[model samples]
Target: HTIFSSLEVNGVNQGLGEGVRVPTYNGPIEDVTSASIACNGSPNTVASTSKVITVQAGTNVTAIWRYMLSTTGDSPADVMDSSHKGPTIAYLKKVDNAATASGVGNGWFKIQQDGMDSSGVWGTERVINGKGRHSIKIPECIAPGQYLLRAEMIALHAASNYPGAQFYMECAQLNVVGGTGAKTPSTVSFPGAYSGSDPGVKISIYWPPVTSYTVPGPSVFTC
Candidate 1:
Protein backbone atom coordinates (compact mmCIF):
# COMPACT_ATOMS: atom_id res chain seq x y z
CA HIS A 1 0.00 0.00 0.00
CA THR A 2 1.92 2.99 -1.29
CA ILE A 3 0.90 6.34 0.16
CA PHE A 4 -1.09 8.69 -2.11
CA SER A 5 -0.92 12.37 -1.16
CA SER A 6 -1.82 13.72 -4.60
CA LEU A 7 -5.21 12.17 -5.26
CA GLU A 8 -7.99 14.31 -6.68
CA VAL A 9 -11.61 13.27 -7.15
CA ASN A 10 -13.39 14.88 -10.06
CA GLY A 11 -16.64 14.32 -12.06
CA VAL A 12 -18.74 13.44 -9.03
CA ASN A 13 -21.49 16.01 -9.56
CA GLN A 14 -24.82 14.43 -8.69
CA GLY A 15 -26.35 14.04 -5.20
CA LEU A 16 -23.95 16.68 -3.96
CA GLY A 17 -24.68 19.93 -2.24
CA GLU A 18 -24.43 23.22 -4.06
CA GLY A 19 -20.93 24.25 -5.08
CA VAL A 20 -19.64 20.72 -4.56
CA ARG A 21 -18.56 18.05 -7.04
CA VAL A 22 -18.21 14.36 -6.41
CA PRO A 23 -14.63 13.55 -5.35
CA THR A 24 -13.56 11.23 -8.12
CA TYR A 25 -9.92 10.69 -8.81
CA ASN A 26 -8.98 11.33 -12.45
CA GLY A 27 -12.02 11.49 -14.74
CA PRO A 28 -15.42 9.88 -14.54
CA ILE A 29 -15.86 6.13 -13.98
CA GLU A 30 -17.28 3.97 -16.78
CA ASP A 31 -19.31 0.75 -16.84
CA VAL A 32 -19.52 0.49 -13.06
CA THR A 33 -22.00 -2.32 -12.32
CA SER A 34 -21.99 -2.77 -8.54
CA ALA A 35 -19.78 -2.55 -5.48
CA SER A 36 -19.96 -4.85 -2.40
CA ILE A 37 -17.69 -4.39 0.58
CA ALA A 38 -17.08 -6.02 3.99
CA CYS A 39 -14.60 -5.68 6.83
CA ASN A 40 -13.65 -7.29 10.16
CA GLY A 41 -12.40 -5.92 13.49
CA SER A 42 -8.78 -6.51 14.42
CA PRO A 43 -5.69 -4.50 15.28
CA ASN A 44 -3.13 -5.65 12.74
CA THR A 45 -4.77 -8.02 10.26
CA VAL A 46 -7.19 -6.99 7.51
CA ALA A 47 -9.79 -9.38 8.82
CA SER A 48 -12.51 -9.97 6.18
CA THR A 49 -11.53 -7.35 3.65
CA SER A 50 -14.17 -5.61 1.57
CA LYS A 51 -16.01 -7.63 -1.06
CA VAL A 52 -16.48 -6.51 -4.67
CA ILE A 53 -20.21 -6.47 -5.46
CA THR A 54 -21.29 -7.61 -8.93
CA VAL A 55 -24.40 -6.37 -10.74
CA GLN A 56 -26.13 -6.48 -14.14
CA ALA A 57 -25.68 -4.11 -17.08
CA GLY A 58 -27.12 -0.62 -16.60
CA THR A 59 -28.41 -1.62 -13.20
CA ASN A 60 -27.98 0.97 -10.47
CA VAL A 61 -26.45 -0.56 -7.37
CA THR A 62 -25.84 0.69 -3.89
CA ALA A 63 -22.40 0.51 -2.17
CA ILE A 64 -22.07 -0.62 1.42
CA TRP A 65 -19.18 -1.50 3.75
CA ARG A 66 -18.30 -2.06 7.41
CA TYR A 67 -15.21 -0.34 8.86
CA MET A 68 -13.51 -2.01 11.80
CA LEU A 69 -11.36 0.55 13.59
CA SER A 70 -8.64 -0.18 16.11
CA THR A 71 -10.28 0.31 19.44
CA THR A 72 -7.05 -0.44 21.31
CA GLY A 73 -5.32 2.56 19.69
CA ASP A 74 -2.74 0.21 18.22
CA SER A 75 -3.46 1.13 14.60
CA PRO A 76 -0.46 2.91 13.00
CA ALA A 77 -1.42 6.53 13.49
CA ASP A 78 -2.87 5.97 16.95
CA VAL A 79 0.46 6.94 18.44
CA MET A 80 2.52 9.56 16.52
CA ASP A 81 3.82 13.11 16.81
CA SER A 82 3.51 16.48 15.00
CA SER A 83 6.30 15.85 12.52
CA HIS A 84 5.01 12.98 10.37
CA LYS A 85 3.72 13.06 6.81
CA GLY A 86 2.53 10.12 4.69
CA PRO A 87 2.52 7.44 1.91
CA THR A 88 4.92 5.32 3.97
CA ILE A 89 4.37 2.02 5.75
CA ALA A 90 2.63 2.16 9.12
CA TYR A 91 5.77 2.05 11.25
CA LEU A 92 8.06 4.19 9.06
CA LYS A 93 8.42 7.95 9.19
CA LYS A 94 6.83 9.97 6.39
CA VAL A 95 9.00 12.14 4.17
CA ASP A 96 6.40 14.76 3.37
CA ASN A 97 3.68 16.45 5.43
CA ALA A 98 2.34 19.43 3.47
CA ALA A 99 -1.16 20.86 3.49
CA THR A 100 -4.10 18.56 2.71
CA ALA A 101 -5.57 20.70 -0.12
CA SER A 102 -2.20 20.83 -1.81
CA GLY A 103 -2.96 17.29 -2.83
CA VAL A 104 0.61 16.39 -2.13
CA GLY A 105 0.88 14.47 1.16
CA ASN A 106 -2.74 14.77 2.11
CA GLY A 107 -4.27 11.93 0.09
CA TRP A 108 -4.77 10.23 3.45
CA PHE A 109 -7.44 12.73 4.55
CA LYS A 110 -9.02 13.71 1.27
CA ILE A 111 -12.49 12.15 1.21
CA GLN A 112 -14.28 14.26 -1.40
CA GLN A 113 -17.59 12.41 -1.55
CA ASP A 114 -21.11 13.84 -1.54
CA GLY A 115 -19.81 17.36 -2.16
CA MET A 116 -17.99 17.30 1.13
CA ASP A 117 -14.25 17.35 1.61
CA SER A 118 -13.05 15.13 4.42
CA SER A 119 -10.06 17.36 5.22
CA GLY A 120 -10.65 21.02 5.53
CA VAL A 121 -10.51 23.12 2.35
CA TRP A 122 -7.04 24.43 3.28
CA GLY A 123 -6.12 24.33 6.91
CA THR A 124 -4.53 22.62 9.90
CA GLU A 125 -5.70 19.52 11.82
CA ARG A 126 -7.25 19.32 15.27
CA VAL A 127 -5.51 18.02 18.42
CA ILE A 128 -7.82 15.30 19.70
CA ASN A 129 -7.27 11.54 19.48
CA GLY A 130 -9.98 9.07 18.54
CA LYS A 131 -10.58 5.92 16.46
CA GLY A 132 -13.70 4.19 15.18
CA ARG A 133 -15.39 2.60 12.16
CA HIS A 134 -16.77 4.64 9.27
CA SER A 135 -19.39 3.65 6.70
CA ILE A 136 -19.03 5.47 3.39
CA LYS A 137 -21.81 5.37 0.81
CA ILE A 138 -21.40 6.40 -2.85
CA PRO A 139 -24.70 6.52 -4.73
CA GLU A 140 -24.95 7.21 -8.45
CA CYS A 141 -25.34 5.46 -11.79
CA ILE A 142 -22.00 4.00 -12.84
CA ALA A 143 -21.08 1.89 -15.87
CA PRO A 144 -19.30 -1.45 -15.71
CA GLY A 145 -15.52 -1.80 -15.77
CA GLN A 146 -12.48 -1.83 -13.49
CA TYR A 147 -12.50 1.15 -11.14
CA LEU A 148 -10.07 2.21 -8.42
CA LEU A 149 -11.51 2.11 -4.90
CA ARG A 150 -10.20 4.04 -1.90
CA ALA A 151 -11.41 4.42 1.69
CA GLU A 152 -10.06 7.13 4.01
CA MET A 153 -10.48 8.11 7.66
CA ILE A 154 -9.73 11.63 8.81
CA ALA A 155 -8.01 12.53 12.11
CA LEU A 156 -7.88 16.29 11.85
CA HIS A 157 -5.93 17.54 14.87
CA ALA A 158 -4.06 14.53 16.16
CA ALA A 159 -2.20 14.63 12.85
CA SER A 160 -0.50 17.80 14.00
CA ASN A 161 1.59 15.51 16.17
CA TYR A 162 2.76 13.92 12.94
CA PRO A 163 3.29 16.12 9.88
CA GLY A 164 0.71 14.27 7.81
CA ALA A 165 -0.95 13.39 11.09
CA GLN A 166 -4.04 12.17 9.33
CA PHE A 167 -4.05 8.47 8.64
CA TYR A 168 -2.90 7.91 5.06
CA MET A 169 -4.38 5.05 3.04
CA GLU A 170 -3.44 3.19 -0.10
CA CYS A 171 -5.90 2.86 -2.95
CA ALA A 172 -7.55 -0.43 -3.93
CA GLN A 173 -8.79 -1.65 -7.32
CA LEU A 174 -12.45 -2.38 -8.09
CA ASN A 175 -13.60 -4.54 -11.04
CA VAL A 176 -17.23 -4.37 -12.15
CA VAL A 177 -17.34 -6.72 -15.12
CA GLY A 178 -20.92 -8.07 -15.52
CA GLY A 179 -24.01 -9.40 -13.70
CA THR A 180 -26.75 -7.77 -11.65
CA GLY A 181 -25.22 -8.54 -8.24
CA ALA A 182 -23.08 -11.44 -9.47
CA LYS A 183 -19.48 -12.43 -8.97
CA THR A 184 -16.98 -10.24 -10.79
CA PRO A 185 -13.90 -11.40 -12.70
CA SER A 186 -10.77 -12.08 -10.65
CA THR A 187 -7.16 -13.01 -11.40
CA VAL A 188 -5.52 -16.36 -10.70
CA SER A 189 -1.86 -17.35 -10.68
CA PHE A 190 -0.62 -20.93 -10.92
CA PRO A 191 2.90 -21.75 -9.84
CA GLY A 192 3.52 -22.78 -13.46
CA ALA A 193 1.62 -22.49 -16.72
CA TYR A 194 -1.20 -25.00 -17.19
CA SER A 195 -1.23 -26.15 -20.78
CA GLY A 196 -4.86 -26.87 -21.62
CA SER A 197 -5.63 -29.18 -24.54
CA ASP A 198 -9.32 -28.24 -24.59
CA PRO A 199 -10.57 -25.34 -26.65
CA GLY A 200 -12.99 -23.93 -24.03
CA VAL A 201 -12.27 -23.90 -20.33
CA LYS A 202 -12.49 -21.45 -17.38
CA ILE A 203 -10.40 -20.84 -14.29
CA SER A 204 -10.66 -17.96 -11.85
CA ILE A 205 -9.35 -16.95 -8.42
CA TYR A 206 -8.57 -13.79 -6.45
CA TRP A 207 -5.01 -12.51 -6.56
CA PRO A 208 -3.54 -10.53 -3.71
CA PRO A 209 -2.68 -6.89 -4.26
CA VAL A 210 0.90 -6.18 -5.22
CA THR A 211 2.50 -4.79 -2.07
CA SER A 212 4.15 -1.34 -1.98
CA TYR A 213 7.68 -2.74 -2.25
CA THR A 214 7.18 -5.05 -5.25
CA VAL A 215 8.82 -3.38 -8.25
CA PRO A 216 8.60 -3.91 -12.06
CA GLY A 217 4.97 -2.83 -11.92
CA PRO A 218 2.46 -5.63 -12.77
CA SER A 219 2.25 -9.09 -11.22
CA VAL A 220 5.02 -11.42 -12.38
CA PHE A 221 3.43 -14.82 -11.60
CA THR A 222 1.44 -16.89 -14.14
CA CYS A 223 -1.48 -19.30 -13.96
Candidate 2:
Protein backbone atom coordinates (compact mmCIF):
# COMPACT_ATOMS: atom_id res chain seq x y z
CA HIS A 1 0.00 0.00 0.00
CA THR A 2 1.40 3.38 -1.12
CA ILE A 3 0.26 6.80 -2.17
CA PHE A 4 1.60 9.24 -4.78
CA SER A 5 1.44 12.01 -2.23
CA SER A 6 3.77 14.71 -3.56
CA LEU A 7 6.10 15.72 -6.37
CA GLU A 8 9.42 17.30 -7.29
CA VAL A 9 9.16 19.61 -10.27
CA ASN A 10 12.49 19.42 -12.08
CA GLY A 11 14.82 19.06 -9.09
CA VAL A 12 12.90 21.23 -6.64
CA ASN A 13 10.95 19.16 -4.15
CA GLN A 14 7.34 20.23 -3.73
CA GLY A 15 6.24 19.39 -0.22
CA LEU A 16 3.79 16.64 0.75
CA GLY A 17 0.21 16.56 -0.53
CA GLU A 18 0.55 19.98 -2.09
CA GLY A 19 -0.90 19.41 -5.56
CA VAL A 20 -1.73 15.72 -5.51
CA ARG A 21 -5.12 14.39 -4.49
CA VAL A 22 -4.45 11.51 -2.16
CA PRO A 23 -6.82 8.60 -1.78
CA THR A 24 -8.98 8.16 1.32
CA TYR A 25 -7.09 4.95 1.98
CA ASN A 26 -3.87 3.23 0.88
CA GLY A 27 -5.70 0.63 -1.18
CA PRO A 28 -5.74 -0.22 -4.88
CA ILE A 29 -8.55 0.47 -7.30
CA GLU A 30 -10.61 -2.69 -6.93
CA ASP A 31 -12.72 -1.97 -10.01
CA VAL A 32 -11.00 -0.54 -13.08
CA THR A 33 -14.27 0.57 -14.66
CA SER A 34 -15.17 2.95 -11.84
CA ALA A 35 -14.47 6.69 -11.70
CA SER A 36 -11.68 5.94 -9.28
CA ILE A 37 -9.70 4.52 -12.22
CA ALA A 38 -9.32 8.09 -13.49
CA CYS A 39 -7.59 9.88 -10.65
CA ASN A 40 -8.04 7.56 -7.67
CA GLY A 41 -10.74 5.81 -5.67
CA SER A 42 -11.81 8.72 -3.52
CA PRO A 43 -15.40 9.27 -2.53
CA ASN A 44 -15.35 13.00 -3.17
CA THR A 45 -15.43 14.76 -6.55
CA VAL A 46 -13.11 17.56 -5.38
CA ALA A 47 -10.24 16.87 -3.07
CA SER A 48 -9.70 18.76 0.20
CA THR A 49 -6.12 19.54 -0.83
CA SER A 50 -6.73 21.72 -3.87
CA LYS A 51 -3.36 23.23 -4.58
CA VAL A 52 -2.07 22.82 -8.16
CA ILE A 53 1.69 22.77 -8.54
CA THR A 54 3.37 24.60 -11.41
CA VAL A 55 5.27 22.31 -13.79
CA GLN A 56 7.53 23.33 -16.63
CA ALA A 57 7.41 21.47 -19.88
CA GLY A 58 10.59 19.71 -21.06
CA THR A 59 11.74 19.02 -17.52
CA ASN A 60 11.44 15.97 -15.33
CA VAL A 61 8.85 15.62 -12.56
CA THR A 62 9.28 13.05 -9.85
CA ALA A 63 6.23 11.80 -8.00
CA ILE A 64 7.05 10.75 -4.46
CA TRP A 65 5.31 7.76 -2.96
CA ARG A 66 4.87 6.87 0.72
CA TYR A 67 3.10 4.21 2.68
CA MET A 68 1.44 6.93 4.69
CA LEU A 69 1.49 10.73 4.69
CA SER A 70 3.22 10.86 8.08
CA THR A 71 6.20 8.68 7.16
CA THR A 72 9.38 10.10 5.58
CA GLY A 73 9.63 7.17 3.15
CA ASP A 74 13.41 7.05 3.12
CA SER A 75 13.60 3.26 2.68
CA PRO A 76 12.19 0.64 0.33
CA ALA A 77 10.12 -0.92 3.07
CA ASP A 78 8.61 2.47 3.86
CA VAL A 79 7.08 2.81 0.39
CA MET A 80 5.68 -0.58 -0.57
CA ASP A 81 6.08 -4.17 0.47
CA SER A 82 9.01 -6.00 -1.20
CA SER A 83 6.76 -8.60 -2.79
CA HIS A 84 4.64 -5.99 -4.63
CA LYS A 85 6.59 -5.75 -7.87
CA GLY A 86 5.19 -4.55 -11.17
CA PRO A 87 5.07 -1.64 -13.65
CA THR A 88 4.85 2.09 -12.91
CA ILE A 89 2.99 4.26 -15.39
CA ALA A 90 1.79 7.86 -15.69
CA TYR A 91 -0.91 9.63 -17.70
CA LEU A 92 -1.89 13.24 -18.37
CA LYS A 93 -5.21 14.79 -19.22
CA LYS A 94 -5.26 18.41 -20.34
CA VAL A 95 -8.16 20.27 -18.81
CA ASP A 96 -9.42 23.81 -18.25
CA ASN A 97 -9.96 23.33 -14.54
CA ALA A 98 -7.68 20.68 -13.10
CA ALA A 99 -9.62 20.59 -9.87
CA THR A 100 -13.09 20.14 -11.29
CA ALA A 101 -12.53 18.03 -14.41
CA SER A 102 -14.12 14.61 -14.18
CA GLY A 103 -11.55 11.93 -14.99
CA VAL A 104 -14.15 9.50 -16.26
CA GLY A 105 -14.72 9.14 -19.99
CA ASN A 106 -11.75 10.45 -22.04
CA GLY A 107 -8.88 12.92 -22.59
CA TRP A 108 -6.11 10.90 -20.96
CA PHE A 109 -2.71 10.21 -22.61
CA LYS A 110 0.28 8.22 -21.48
CA ILE A 111 3.32 10.28 -20.60
CA GLN A 112 5.46 7.50 -19.13
CA GLN A 113 5.45 3.72 -18.77
CA ASP A 114 8.37 1.94 -17.09
CA GLY A 115 7.68 -1.75 -17.44
CA MET A 116 9.96 -4.71 -16.70
CA ASP A 117 13.49 -3.90 -17.86
CA SER A 118 15.92 -6.15 -19.73
CA SER A 119 17.24 -7.64 -16.49
CA GLY A 120 13.69 -8.33 -15.27
CA VAL A 121 13.64 -5.38 -12.85
CA TRP A 122 10.20 -3.87 -12.61
CA GLY A 123 9.35 -0.17 -12.47
CA THR A 124 7.77 -0.52 -9.03
CA GLU A 125 10.97 -2.10 -7.73
CA ARG A 126 12.96 0.92 -8.84
CA VAL A 127 10.45 3.18 -7.14
CA ILE A 128 10.75 1.22 -3.95
CA ASN A 129 14.55 1.08 -3.98
CA GLY A 130 14.83 4.73 -5.02
CA LYS A 131 13.04 5.79 -1.85
CA GLY A 132 9.61 6.03 -3.39
CA ARG A 133 10.50 8.31 -6.26
CA HIS A 134 8.69 7.72 -9.58
CA SER A 135 10.14 10.03 -12.21
CA ILE A 136 8.77 11.07 -15.63
CA LYS A 137 9.38 14.02 -17.91
CA ILE A 138 6.71 16.33 -19.23
CA PRO A 139 6.22 16.57 -22.99
CA GLU A 140 8.25 19.47 -24.35
CA CYS A 141 5.85 20.16 -27.20
CA ILE A 142 2.62 19.75 -25.31
CA ALA A 143 0.10 22.54 -24.97
CA PRO A 144 0.40 24.70 -21.90
CA GLY A 145 -2.63 24.38 -19.66
CA GLN A 146 -4.07 22.83 -16.55
CA TYR A 147 -3.74 19.05 -16.44
CA LEU A 148 -4.36 16.18 -14.11
CA LEU A 149 -1.35 13.91 -13.96
CA ARG A 150 -2.14 10.34 -13.04
CA ALA A 151 0.84 8.49 -11.56
CA GLU A 152 0.21 4.79 -11.07
CA MET A 153 1.73 1.60 -9.68
CA ILE A 154 0.36 -1.81 -10.72
CA ALA A 155 1.29 -4.57 -8.28
CA LEU A 156 1.14 -8.12 -9.65
CA HIS A 157 2.27 -10.13 -6.65
CA ALA A 158 -1.00 -12.04 -6.66
CA ALA A 159 -1.92 -11.66 -10.32
CA SER A 160 -2.56 -15.26 -11.28
CA ASN A 161 -6.01 -14.37 -12.63
CA TYR A 162 -8.35 -11.47 -13.42
CA PRO A 163 -8.93 -8.90 -10.61
CA GLY A 164 -5.77 -10.04 -8.90
CA ALA A 165 -3.61 -7.11 -9.93
CA GLN A 166 -3.65 -4.14 -7.55
CA PHE A 167 -3.62 -0.63 -9.03
CA TYR A 168 -2.48 2.31 -6.90
CA MET A 169 -2.66 5.82 -8.32
CA GLU A 170 -3.35 9.49 -7.57
CA CYS A 171 -3.80 12.66 -9.62
CA ALA A 172 -1.62 15.74 -9.37
CA GLN A 173 -3.18 18.99 -10.45
CA LEU A 174 -0.66 20.95 -12.50
CA ASN A 175 -0.37 24.14 -14.48
CA VAL A 176 2.15 23.35 -17.18
CA VAL A 177 4.12 26.21 -18.64
CA GLY A 178 6.69 26.65 -21.47
CA GLY A 179 5.48 24.48 -24.35
CA THR A 180 5.31 24.85 -28.14
CA GLY A 181 1.78 23.43 -28.35
CA ALA A 182 2.75 21.46 -31.44
CA LYS A 183 1.48 18.07 -30.33
CA THR A 184 -1.96 17.01 -29.17
CA PRO A 185 -1.41 13.43 -28.17
CA SER A 186 -4.07 10.84 -28.78
CA THR A 187 -6.28 10.11 -25.76
CA VAL A 188 -8.08 7.17 -24.14
CA SER A 189 -10.61 6.68 -21.38
CA PHE A 190 -9.42 5.09 -18.16
CA PRO A 191 -12.04 2.34 -18.07
CA GLY A 192 -11.93 2.09 -21.83
CA ALA A 193 -8.14 1.90 -21.99
CA TYR A 194 -7.68 -1.37 -20.07
CA SER A 195 -9.19 -4.82 -20.02
CA GLY A 196 -9.09 -7.76 -17.61
CA SER A 197 -7.40 -9.97 -20.22
CA ASP A 198 -4.54 -7.52 -20.83
CA PRO A 199 -1.36 -9.58 -20.59
CA GLY A 200 0.21 -7.21 -18.11
CA VAL A 201 -2.74 -7.30 -15.70
CA LYS A 202 -3.71 -10.97 -15.42
CA ILE A 203 -0.76 -13.38 -15.47
CA SER A 204 1.38 -15.67 -13.35
CA ILE A 205 4.52 -13.70 -12.54
CA TYR A 206 5.83 -16.26 -10.06
CA TRP A 207 5.42 -19.72 -11.64
CA PRO A 208 6.54 -19.01 -15.22
CA PRO A 209 9.09 -16.40 -14.09
CA VAL A 210 7.93 -13.66 -16.44
CA THR A 211 10.73 -13.26 -18.96
CA SER A 212 9.15 -10.23 -20.62
CA TYR A 213 6.13 -8.02 -19.95
CA THR A 214 3.75 -5.77 -21.86
CA VAL A 215 2.46 -2.73 -19.99
CA PRO A 216 -1.29 -2.49 -20.37
CA GLY A 217 -1.91 1.01 -21.77
CA PRO A 218 -1.20 3.35 -24.66
CA SER A 219 2.38 4.12 -25.63
CA VAL A 220 4.10 7.09 -24.05
CA PHE A 221 3.36 10.33 -25.91
CA THR A 222 6.77 11.96 -25.73
CA CYS A 223 6.78 14.55 -28.48
For this target, which candidate reaches the highest TM-score against the unseen true structure? 2
Q: lDDT tens string, model 2, 1-223? A: 8888889886777777778887647788756677778887655332546787888898889999998778764699789987989999999999888877766778999999988988989999999999898988899899998998999999999888888898898888889999789999999998779888899989888888888999998988978
> Please, what is the whole-model Cα lDDT of each candidate in the order they appear?
0.22, 0.86
lDDT of 1 by residue, 1-223 (tens): 1122121122221121111111222111111111111110112132122332332333332221112122134233432333321211110001122111111121121112221123412110121121212223222233344333343322223222222223333233233344233322222211111112111011111122212211101122111
Candidate 1 displacement at residue 18 in angstroms: 36
Candidate 1's displacement at residue 223, Å, is: 40
TM-score for predicted model 1 compared with the true structure? 0.25
C-alpha lDDT of candidate 1 relative to the true structure: 0.22
The numbered model that scores best in lDDT is 2
